[PDB]
Amino acid sequence: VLFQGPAERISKQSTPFVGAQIFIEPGQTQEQIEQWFKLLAESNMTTCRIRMFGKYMKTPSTYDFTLFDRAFKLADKYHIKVYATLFPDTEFTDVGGFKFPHSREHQKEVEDYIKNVVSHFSQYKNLAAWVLINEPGTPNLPFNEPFTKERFSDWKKEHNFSEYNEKGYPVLNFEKENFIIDYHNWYLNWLANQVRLYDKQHDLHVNPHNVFKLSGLYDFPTWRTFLNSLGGSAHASWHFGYFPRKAYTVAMSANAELIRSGAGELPWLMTELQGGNNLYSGANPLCPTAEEIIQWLWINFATEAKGGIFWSFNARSTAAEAGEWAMINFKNKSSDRLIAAATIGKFITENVKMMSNIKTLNSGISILYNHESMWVEAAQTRGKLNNGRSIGAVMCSPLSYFEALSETGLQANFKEIKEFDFSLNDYTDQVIILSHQIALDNKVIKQLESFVEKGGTLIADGLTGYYDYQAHSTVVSGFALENLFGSYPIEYKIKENLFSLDFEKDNYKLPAHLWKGTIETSKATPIMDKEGECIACINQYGKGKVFWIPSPIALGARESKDFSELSKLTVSLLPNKILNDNPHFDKHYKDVMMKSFKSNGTMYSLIINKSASVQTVDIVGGKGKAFILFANKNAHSTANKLTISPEETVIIKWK
Amino acid sequence: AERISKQSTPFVGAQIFIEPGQTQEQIEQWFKLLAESNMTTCRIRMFGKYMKTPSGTYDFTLFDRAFKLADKYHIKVYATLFPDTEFTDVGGFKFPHSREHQKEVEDYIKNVVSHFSQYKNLAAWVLINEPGTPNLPFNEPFTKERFSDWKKEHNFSEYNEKGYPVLNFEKENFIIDYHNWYLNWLANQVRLYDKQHDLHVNPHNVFKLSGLYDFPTWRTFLNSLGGSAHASWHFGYFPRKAYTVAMSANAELIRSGAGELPWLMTELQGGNNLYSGANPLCPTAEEIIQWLWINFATEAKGGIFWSFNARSTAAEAGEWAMINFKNKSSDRLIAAATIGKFITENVKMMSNIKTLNSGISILYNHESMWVEAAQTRGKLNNGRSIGAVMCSPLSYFEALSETGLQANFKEIKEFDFSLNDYTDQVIILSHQIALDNKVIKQLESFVEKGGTLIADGLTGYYDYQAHSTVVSGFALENLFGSYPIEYKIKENLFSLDFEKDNYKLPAHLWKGTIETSKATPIMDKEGECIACINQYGKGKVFWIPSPIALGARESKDFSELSKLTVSLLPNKILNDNPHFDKHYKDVMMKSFKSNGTMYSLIINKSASVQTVDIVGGKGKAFILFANKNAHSTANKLTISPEETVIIKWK
Amino acid sequence: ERISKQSTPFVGAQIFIEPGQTQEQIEQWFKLLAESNMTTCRIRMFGKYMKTPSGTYDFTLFDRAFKLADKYHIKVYATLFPDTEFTDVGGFKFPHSREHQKEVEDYIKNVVSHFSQYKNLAAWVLINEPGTPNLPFNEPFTKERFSDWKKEHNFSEYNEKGYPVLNFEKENFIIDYHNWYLNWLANQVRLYDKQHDLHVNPHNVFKLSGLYDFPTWRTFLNSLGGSAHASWHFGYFPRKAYTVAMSANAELIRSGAGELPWLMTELQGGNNLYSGANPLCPTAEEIIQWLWINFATEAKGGIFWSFNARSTAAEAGEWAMINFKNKSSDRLIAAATIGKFITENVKMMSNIKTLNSGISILYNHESMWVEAAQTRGKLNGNGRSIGAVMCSPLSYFEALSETGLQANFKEIKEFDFSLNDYTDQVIILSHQIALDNKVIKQLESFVEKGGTLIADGLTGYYDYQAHSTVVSGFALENLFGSYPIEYKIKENLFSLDFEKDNYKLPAHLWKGTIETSKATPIMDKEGECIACINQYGKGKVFWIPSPIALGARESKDFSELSKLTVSLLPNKILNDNPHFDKHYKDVMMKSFKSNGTMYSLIINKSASVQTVDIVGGKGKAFILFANKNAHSTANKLTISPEETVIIKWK
Ligand SMILES: OC[C@H]1CN[C@@H](O)[C@@H](O)[C@@H]1O
Ligand SMILES: OC[C@H]1CN[C@@H](O)[C@@H](O)[C@@H]1O
Ligand SMILES: OC[C@H]1CN[C@@H](O)[C@@H](O)[C@@H]1O
Ligand SMILES: [Cl-]
Ligand SMILES: [Cl-]
Ligand SMILES: [Cl-]
C-alpha cells in the first residue's frame, strides 16, 4: 500500500489480462515494432513479455540497452505493461535458456547481467514483473558441468543417509532427485535475491513447464517464499503428449489446477500458451484453432488465472522457430487466433468485477500426485517410455480420474500431496483420489488415517502404497496401509494391456490395465469377482470410508479410451453433499467438460463440447436458472439443458 | 557329505531370499511352508554386502540364522558365492574389476567357504550366479590386460594357408577362455577350503549366450551343471504357448553341456513380473507342472524356483515369489508341491530317468553365432539379424516336438564323432553358417559310417575365419555331392514349389540353387535345382540351401518341416521311438526310460482337447500322471488344453 | 584412348582381386567377361595387397590381373585405394594424419609409375566413393584443416540488416575439403601420368549431394562417375520406381558432368545376402532397364559391382554377376545383350544426346543444409525430416516420368543463368527452402526473358543463413507478385480442392495461404488463396506454397501433379517432345537423339500390359529394342511388365 508505490502489484483481486510475447532481436525496425504494439493494444491485450537477451545487450568489451529501450518505450506509448524475463547470454541455438550456471565464473557473469539489466529496466513505469528464469527445470540436468557437480557433492556431504532403514532392510535414498529439488529451490531463490539487491518494487514471477513430466523437479510450496506470482508454460505442441488433441481441454484444465495448487495463497497466471503454428518445432505439432484459443483462455480464467500470455505475438526470424508460433500473419495482421484472443480481452473490460474476483468452485475432490511416486517409478521401470511399466503411468493414472470427472462436469483439484492441507478437524464431504501413487511413507499414511477418521473419502486404485519413499515395499515387509484399508494385498498377476474386472454381483465390468490385484479383508467389506477372488473393498474408518481396488482401473479407462465406467463408479462413491451443492452433468458425456466458479457470491459454469456432434447437456446440482453470458457458436438453454456445438465454449451465469 | 550323481533322487526347491530387516519369525514361516510343499532344497545368495562389517571383517549371523532354520526343517542349501556388489546390481558381476577386486573376492571365498562348509545341510557351492553377460567389460583394466596377454600368446595371421584374407575372432575366442579361467579359478579357490561339497554353476539366457560357454571344459572342475531358464528373460524367441518347446530345448542344451555330469535347473520362474522381465508373465499352475516334468524327463536332478519369497526393496520388490504377500501358497506353490509329492511316491522311477535318445541330434556351434554377429553387423529382429543361427535349429526342434520325437540340442564339440557306426543316427545342421575343415572331416566320417545328415539354410557358407569356400572352392562339395550356384534374396516368407506332386515348403528370405555331381537333384516348378540327396558310404545327406526351418518359424507352421524330416529318418527311429501318427500343432511329446521301463511325457498347448495317436516303441499305455483326467483308448491319448500327461508303457 | 562425348559406350564390371585367387580362376573371369561383350573392368588397387613388410611395393598380384585383362583386350579403370583396415569396405575418404598423407603420396608414386606403363589402362579412379555422412572431425588431419579454414574465413553472427544468422561453417568447409582432397589426388597422379583419364564415383547422391561441388571437380577430371546401387542409394523409392531413381541419379551426374562425359562407375550386379540397406538380387529385366536409362542419359559406360565376389567376411559371395561355378547368371546374360546391341549399332550408341524437354528440376546444397538445422536430424522423407528437400524435387521428377517427359535434375549452380532468352524453358523449385538474393536475381532474369517458374512447398522460406525473409520482408515478393500469409500444419496427407473444380491436389503436412498484389489469385473451395500465376516480363510464375510434390509422394499418386504441371508447360514443349497422351502410373519414357535421328526409351513397371499413346515430336514408331515382344500400331506402344523398349522415330 506504501512499499507498493507506483508499480501495480499483482493480487488475487487483480483484473485478469490477455497478452503475448513481443519477440525482440537485432535487425527489427522501429516501424515493425510499433506495428506489433499498436495491433496488440487494438486486440484488447494489456501485457507483453520480453526475453531480455544478454546476447543482444553485451558489447565487444559493457551493457548497451538500446534494443530493449526502443521496445519498452513503444510498449509504454501503447499503455502495455512488460513481463521482463532474465535471460543471460547463451548460444543463439539455445532456444529455452540454461537452467543453472555452468561454473563459478559463469555465476559471476549472471550476477553482473542481473545488476546491469535490473538497475536499468526497473526505472520504466510500464514494468509489471521480473521473470526470474525462463522455464526452470529440464529432463537432462547437467551433472557433468563443474558448478552442478560441486553443488551435488557438497549436498551429499551435508546429508547423512544410511543404506538401511530403521527395521534393517536395504533402501534407496534418491539423493539425485532430492538434491535436484533443493537445487531448483536454491537457484530460483538466489535469482530472486539478486533481483532484490536492485529492485524491491516489482513482482517476481517464474514459468514451470512440461508439468506432467517435470513436476518431480518442482517444490512449489518453497517457491512461494520468494515469488509474488506463479506462472507456467502450457503448450499444446510440447506438454500434452499424454492426451489426444480433442482432450487438450482436459490437459489445460489439469495444467491450470496443478499450477493453482502450487500457487497456494499466491496468484497465478499462464506465462506461455501456444499462439501459432508449428512448422519444424514442437513434439505434437499443430496450429491452434480460434476455438482452441477461446477454450484455453476460459479454462485458465475459470481456474483463477490472472493472465494468459501467448508465445508469441510476432515470430523469431532466423533458424529455430523462424516464422513459427505467431498470432500475427506474415503481413503483421491478425490471424483468426488473435481475433479470438481479442474477444476475450474485450469480454474482460466489459465484465471487470466478475473477471477480477474469480474463485474456482472446489467440489471437495482432490486428485493427489507426489514427487516420490514419480521417482520410484523412474527407478523401477529403468526409464522405458510408452503404460504401467513405463515413465508417466504415475501421472497418466490421476489424469485419467481427472478426465473421468471432467466428462461428469465435476471440478477436481490436482495437487502435490504436500500442497494438500492435512491439518483440519473435519473432512466430511472431502474426497482424496490416490490413483497409482506407488510411493507413500509412514508420515503421509498417518495424514491419510487422520483425513478418513475425520470424515474424508479415500479412493485408491493401481499400485498406490506398494512402496515407501525409499522404494521399500511394505506389501512385502508388513503393509503400512493395512490399518487404513482394513485389508492386505495377496497377489499381483500381470495380464494383457487391457482386461476386464468382472464383479460377482450385477454382471458389472471395469476396464483394467496390465496387473490384476487380489486382497484379503480383515475389517473392510470384501468385493468379489466372478472367479471368486477378492479384487476390492470398502473400509468404514471413523467417520470416513476407503475404497481400494489394487488393479489400475484409471489406466484401464485410459487404455480403453472410455471413462464412462470410471465416471459412474467415482460418482457412486462421492458424498451426497458434493452432488447436491455442485453443478455437474445428469450423466457421463464423452468429450464434454464443465468446471464451475464463483465471483462475489454469483456462481458460473464453463462448458466446452469437444465431440463431433451437437450435445444437449442436462446440468443438475447447485441452484439457479442458466443464463448464457458467453457462447461463440449460438448455444441455447431450455431450463438447465444446454445445447452446445462442436468446439463451442459456453459461460453460464446462475441467476 | 552327500554328492549328486545320475542316480540321485530328483528334488523340487526354491530360492530363499535373505537380506537384513527380515525377522526370525518370517524366515521360519518360509522354511516351514517350503518343507510342507514337498521341497527338499533351497538356494541362498551369500551376499558379501550383508556379511562385511565396517572394519572389513566378516559377520556370518544373518546367514547362520537361515542355515540353522534350513537344518531344523531338513532342507539342504545351494550356497551361491556372491561377493560385495552394488545393491542395484541384480545379477552380480561376471569378472573381477581389477587385481585389487580379485583379492577381495579371494578373501570373500576364504571367509564364506571356511565358515559355511561346516553346516551338515550344505549341498553345493554355486561358483558364481549366472556366468556370462552380453556386455563384457573390455574397458575395465583387469579384462583389458588379460585380453592383451591372450592376443600376444596366440599367433594369428591375416591370411589362411591358401593366401585369402581371414577374420580370427580374437575377442570371441578370448571370451571363451576368460569364462573357462574365472570359473576354474573360483572352483580352485573353493577347493582350498572345501573338497567335500559339489561345485555347481547356472549358465543363463542360453539361446543368446551359448557362444560364451565351453561346457566340455567346465566339466573338468564342476560336479553338476545348472541353468537359469526364465520364461520372462530367456524365451524371447518363442511365444508363450511354445514355452514347452523353449524349456525342452533349454533342458537339452544343458544336458548336452553336462555330458557325464548330472545337471539340474538352478532357476525357474516362480512368480509374477510387476516391473521386471523382458516378456513379463505370472506363470500358471499348469506351466509350473509343464516345466518340472519337461526338466525331469530331460534328466534334471532338480528344479529350483526363483523365488520362494520376494526381495523387499527396489528391483523385483514383491516380484517372482511362489508365496503370496501373507506368506501362504499361490496356485504355483500348490502345483510344485504335487510334483515333490509324486517324486516321494515314485522314488525308484524318478531317480533313474534316462532320456530316450531318438538318435536325432540338432547341432549348433559357437562359430556360426560369431560369424553371424560379424555379417549382420548386429541388426536385431530374421536371417539378416543376430539369432537366426539359433532360431533355425530351434525351429527344427519345435517341428520334431510337434511330431512327438525327442531331439538332442548340442554344441558340435559335445557330439561324439569317434564311434565306428552311426547307422540310424541323424544330425541336423540348420543354418549353421560356419563349418571348418576339421568338423567337415568329422561329418564325412559320420555319414560314411551310416549317419543321416540334414542341412538347410546357409549351413557351411563360411569357415571359422568367415572365409566362404562357396566362393574359393566349396569344402562340403565331397560330402554334399553338389555345389551352390546362387542365393537370390526374396520376401521374408516365400514358397519352394517342388516339381513332384505340386508340393510346397515355406522358406525364409533367401532361395538357394545348386548343381549336383554325385547327388540326386530335386527340382522346383521353375526348373531350378533347390535340394539334393547324396548317398555317401553307408549314410545319406539331404541338402536344401534355402532356410526352410526359418520359413516354418516365419509362417508359424511346422507341419511341412515335420512331414519332410520324418520322410528322411531311418525306419529304426520311427519303429523304436514312440511319436505321433502325424504332426500336431502345439502338442509336444518326449520319451524316457527308468530301469527297463519306457515312459512318455505329453503336453497339449493348443486351445482345444486333442486326440494324439501314439505309434512306435512297444507296450500298452497306463496313465500314471494327468492333471486334467486325460484318458486313452488303445494308444490314442485324449488330452486337455494345458494338461501334462505321463504314460507308463507296460 | 581418352574418353569424350563421342566415345562408344561400354558395359563392364569390377574384377575383384585379393590374395589366394589362382591364375586359373582370374583367367576364367576375364575370358567370360570378354565373351559377355564387356570391354572394360575396374580394379581396386589395394595398398594392403602390394605393401611388403619392409614398406617396398610388390605389384605381382595386380600385374597378374592387368596381364590377363590385356590378353583378353579388356581395359582397366584402376582405383587408387591405399592401405586401410580389411573391415573398411568403402575406403577412407580423407587422410587420418600428415604421416598418413605421406603414405598416400608414396602409394600413388609407386602404383601410378608402375601401372601407367600398361597399354590397357583406361583411367585412374582418384578415390573410391568420395564423401561420407560422418566426416572424421576428431582425427588430427581433418581437425587441423577445419581450424585453418575457419581462420581464413571471416563470418559475423549478424547479416547486413542486423538479424542473427547461421553461417554453416561445417557444411561450407566440407565442400571445400572434398574439392581440396580430390584436386590434390589429381595433382599427385599428374606428377607421374598426364596420359590417362581421371575419374571419380560420387555415391548415395540423393543424401550426399550436399558434399559435392561438381562444377569445381570438372577443373581436374576427364569424366564424372557414380555409384548408383539399388540396395544402398534408392531408399527414397519403392523397387517398382528404381527406374525413376536411376533416371534421376543419371540426370544428377550428367548435370554435375557439364561439358565432361560421364559414366556409371558402379551398378548393382548381384545378390545381397547380409549386405545392403534395401537388399535385392536385381532381375535380368532390371539390368536391361538400368543400362538403357543410363545410355539414354548420355552415359559412356555402365560398370557392375561386381563381376566376381569377395571371398571373406563383408560381402563374401555377394554382388557377383557370375554364379559360384564362375558361369553367367541371368544378370550377366542380360548385360551381354546390351554390349552386343552396342557393337551392332556403334554410330547410334556413340552419339547419344538426351532430348532436353527444357524442364530443369533444381536442388541446392543450402536447402539441404538449412533442412538439417531446422529438423534437428529427424528421419525418413516426411516434411519435418532430413531428405524432404530431395524427395520433393524427386516427386516432380517421377510425375514427369509418368507423363513420358524428360527433366534435368541439377544443382542450382549447374544451371546456366547467363542466356538472353528462356522462352519455352521451365525451372521447378519444389521445397527448395533456402534461396539467397543472388539466386533470386538470377530467377527474376530467367522469368523476365520468357522462363516458366513452378515453385511448391516452402521454396524460398529461408535464405542461405537460415534467416526467413518470409518474416523480415519476403525476397520473392517482386517475382511472385504475392506474399505468404500463413502456414497451418495439417495431417500427413490432405486435399487442396481448387474453386474451379479443375483440380484436387494431394498435399503434405502444411497448408500455405497467400495474398496476391500483381499475381492472379487461385482460390480453394474453402475460399482461401492457396496459389497464384504471376506474368513477369515474357515469362510466368506458378506458386503453390503447400507441398504438392510431397503430397503426391505421400499419396503414391502422381496423376494430379502430372496434369497440373502439363497444363503449365509452354505449348512448344508438348508439340516438340514425345510424351504420353495422359499420365500412366508406373510407366516411364525419356527421349534422345543420335546425329539427327530421334529415339524414345519406354519401361513398363506396372503389373499389367500397358498401351501407351505417344504424342508430340514427329515420325512413325519403329521398335529397335524390346526384350518381351512389344508391338506398336501407329504411335500406340503395347509394352509388357518389366519390358524395356527403344523406339526409333522414322
Ligand atoms: O517453443 C516455443 C517457446 C516455448 N518456450 C518459450 O520460453 C520459448 O523458449 C520457446 O521458443
Ligand atoms: O530376475 C530374477 C532372477 C533371475 N536371476 C537370478 O540369479 C537373480 O539374480 C534374479 O533376481
Ligand atoms: O557394397 C558394394 C560395393 C559398393 N561400393 C564399392 O566401391 C565397394 O566398396 C562395395 O563393395
Ligand atoms: Cl521470455
Ligand atoms: Cl543365488
Ligand atoms: Cl574399386
Author numbering:
A (entry chain AAA): 25 to 85, 87 to 411, 413 to 681
B (entry chain BBB): 31 to 411, 413 to 681
C (entry chain CCC): 32 to 681
Paste lines from the article.
In contrast to initial reports, this enzyme has no α-mannosidase activity; instead, Bs164 cleaves β-mannosidic linkages in aryl β-mannosidase and mannooligosaccharides. X-ray crystal structures of Bs164 reveal a homotrimeric quaternary structure with each individual chain containing three domains. The catalytic domain of Bs164 consists of a (β/α)8 barrel with catalytic residues on β-strands 4 and 7 placing this family in clan GH-A. NMR analysis revealed a retaining mechanism and site-directed mutagenesis confirmed the assignment of the nucleophile and acid/base catalytic residues.
Mannoimidazole and noeuromycin act as competitive inhibitors of Bs164 with inhibition constants (Ki) of 470 ± 60 μm and 340 ± 40 nm, respectively. The structure of the noeuromycin complex, in which a 1S5 conformation is observed, lends further support to this itinerary. The acid/base residue, Glu-160, is positioned to perform anti-protonation of the leaving group, typical of clan GH-A glycoside hydrolases. This residue forms hydrogen-bonding interactions with both the endocyclic nitrogen in noeuromycin and imidazole nitrogen in mannoimidazole, an interaction that is also seen in GH26 and GH113 β-mannanases and GH2 β-mannosidases. Another arginine, Arg-75 (which is bound to chlorine) hydrogen bonds to O3 of all inhibitors and the O2 of mannoimidazole and noeuromycin. The O2 hydroxyl also hydrogen bonds to Asn-159 in all three inhibitor structures and the nucleophile (Glu-297) in mannoimidazole and noeuromycin structures. The mannosidase inhibitors are recognized in the −1 subsite by eight polar amino acids, which are within hydrogen bonding distance to the substrate.
